[PDB]
Amino acid sequence: EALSKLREDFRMQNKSVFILGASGETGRVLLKEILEQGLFSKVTLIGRRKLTFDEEAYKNVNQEVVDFEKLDDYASAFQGHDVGFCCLGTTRGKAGAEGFVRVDRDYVLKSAELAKAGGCKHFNLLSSKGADKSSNFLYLQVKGEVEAKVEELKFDRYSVFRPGVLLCDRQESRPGEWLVRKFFGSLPDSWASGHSVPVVTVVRAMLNNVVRPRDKQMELLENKAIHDLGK
Amino acid sequence: EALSKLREDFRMQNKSVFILGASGETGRVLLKEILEQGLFSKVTLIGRRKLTFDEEAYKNVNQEVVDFEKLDDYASAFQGHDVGFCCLGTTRGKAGAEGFVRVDRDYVLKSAELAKAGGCKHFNLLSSKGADKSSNFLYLQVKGEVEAKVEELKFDRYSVFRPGVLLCDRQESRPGEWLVRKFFGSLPDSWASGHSVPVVTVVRAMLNNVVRPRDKQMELLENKAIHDLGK
Numbered sequence A, B: 001e002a003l004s005k006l007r008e009d010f011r012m013q014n015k016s017v018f019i020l021g022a023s024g025e026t027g028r029v030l031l032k033e034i035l036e037q038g039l040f041s042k043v044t045l046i047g048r049r050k051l052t053f054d055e056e057a058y059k060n061v062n063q064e065v066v067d068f069e070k071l072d073d074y075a076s077a078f079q080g081h082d083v084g085f086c087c088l089g090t091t092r093g094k095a096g097a098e099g100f101v102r103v104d105r106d107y108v109l110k111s112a113e114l115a116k117a118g119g120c121k122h123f124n125l126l127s128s129k130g131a132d133k134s135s136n137f138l139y140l141q142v143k144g145e146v147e148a149k150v151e152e153l154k155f156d157r158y159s160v161f162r163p164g165v166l167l168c169d170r171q172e173s174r175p176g177e178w179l180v181r182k183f184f185g186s187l188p189d190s191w192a193s194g195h196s197v198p199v200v201t202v203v204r205a206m207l208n209n210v211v212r213p214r215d216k217q218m219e220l221l222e223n224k225a226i227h228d229l230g231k
Ligand SMILES: NC(=O)C1=CN([C@@H]2O[C@H](COP(=O)(O)OP(=O)(O)OC[C@H]3O[C@@H](n4cnc5c(N)ncnc54)[C@H](OP(=O)(O)O)[C@@H]3O)[C@@H](O)[C@H]2O)C=CC1
Pocket: A020, A021, A022, A023, A024, A025, A026, A027, A047, A048, A049, A068, A087, A088, A089, A090, A103, A126, A127, A128, A129, A163, A164, A165, A166, A167, B173, B174, B175, B176, B177
């Protein structure tokens, strides 16, 4: 109800959004929810390849195909958007150690830099629970490092999300949750919420947050807060 | 290619199929793949509630809404199908201990009994890795018990599938796999396949198996075999 009011006010602001990582599993859910909620008057995807869609609402989605190795040459793709969401990410297994840093730190930071120069007022970064630039684990070290480097850009509003392992298709209430929980010991039915979170809940938290009036310059939501806001 | 030949031969046999648990996550993927592959000339869902669908192919799907507490009164719903798939299942958290036994053992066994009496020649049961009727863990004890009780019905062909924890949306190649694997230690990139499996792979294994000519009266596929056959 109050949230409904915030969404209406937000739609009246005629805001545009750009998304990095829309082809990914979190990104595709974010795009779908953005279209289902009709929060933005213009939606632009920025990525390495053109995507093909099903439903009709996708017909109005703009796509900017870029070469991340020469991103500066595609600076125009980052011009004029009010809000940005970054769901890009790879793994060491798929890209090697250096390739992982290249995507999760370099491409993300460069994109953020171009977005700031392009007028973006609210940048949203999908990070991970445990992000720590001092970590000895490459994945968490890089997440902590890129969080800090994007903070330095000083967006009017910067939101960092640190979800636990991403679930899908109600895994949290299906038999697999019982099997995993039992493997770890005699635990309470709410144990899973501490280390995991459904991707739809993460997206709902991101969009419920986007319609709240800007307050603090930097917001960082840990897994519990994501569960609470993504209700 | 050889598999393509088996599928063609199977379609020429004009077989009908019934599915229990089509509303579930594995069941819905099984139904979708059955329609996409066009393996059966008649598809019937048996369950506690009527389901509503999207795509056109679902228009020919028959639905039998039954009361599992009085299943004998719905014996006609099990009449005449050649193949049956059971993807029913609940949890202790959702149904309590007795309620879990009621669904996973009682409803499943009763359904199998009615299917056998109804002429079903090939019954497929979705069980779990670790199923053991002697287990001290309720979930695995019940899975092991119902596997044995259905074996006693002596279907012409009985296939039991024991998948590890069910994944979805490429979780096996996304960052969550790296996080979970690292939590467990320094492990090889193929570690996850030993304890988990994508639901689509499970369904593909089930359907690749269904088109193979009957050989042994009972077949039991463990997680590795499911990964291999569900390629
Ligand atoms: N999955 C999980 O459990 C968790 C994930 N995270 C974080 O959330 C974010 C999203 O994760 P998730 O949705 O699972 O990721 P996915 O693997 O589903 O999506 C990854 C995205 O990044 C893009 N990408 C990857 N490599 C490149 C590249 N070399 N060049 C250009 N684009 C690239 C992909 O594009 P393309 O389709 O072209 O490859 C895709 O859009 C990541 O930053 C991840 O670290 C946080 C907590 C847990």
